Design brief:
The PDB classes it as endonuclease. Keywords: alpha/beta protein alpha/beta protein, endonuclease. By secondary structure, the chain is of the alpha+beta class. It has one domain (about 1-105): Nuclear Transport Factor 2, Chain: A. It is built from three helices and six strands; from the N terminus they run αβααβββββ. Strands 1-2-3-4-5-6 form a six-stranded mixed β-sheet. The two termini are about 15 Å apart. The relative contact order is 0.21.
């Protein structure tokens, strides 16, 4: 499951990412080197996802006790793309296709 709909649906129902996601730190621990675009070599069929997304810019709606996390969408191999699923602790799901410049609601 690595599509915007697939993941979105999975999260509001299961409240966790599908098993194909690993954090940056887990990835790094397995030999991932971002500068090399080698994720699919060291962690075949996994995608980066699950890390806290700051929202420093306040672009996503804040709320006390609301934490945002991100996950890559549509990744298969090579360098990460520009697609990200943004999801809150309360299961609001937003999407960005431009490296977090802009966001639109998907759930």
């Amino acid at each position: 499951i690595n599509t915007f709909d697939g993941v979105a649906d999975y999260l509001q129902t299961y409240h966790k990412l599908p098993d194909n996601y690993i954090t940056k730190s887990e990835a790094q621990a397995l030999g991932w080197v971002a500068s090399k675009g080698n994720l699919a070599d060291v962690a075949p069929g996994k995608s980066i996802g699950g890390d806290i997304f700051s929202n420093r810019e306040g672009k996503l709606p804040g709320k006390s006790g609301r934490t945002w996390r991100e996950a890559d969408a549509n990744y298969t191999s090579g360098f990460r793309n520009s697609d990200r699923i943004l999801y809150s602790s309360d299961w609001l799901i937003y999407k960005t296709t431009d490296h977090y410049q802009t966001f639109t609601k998907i759930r």
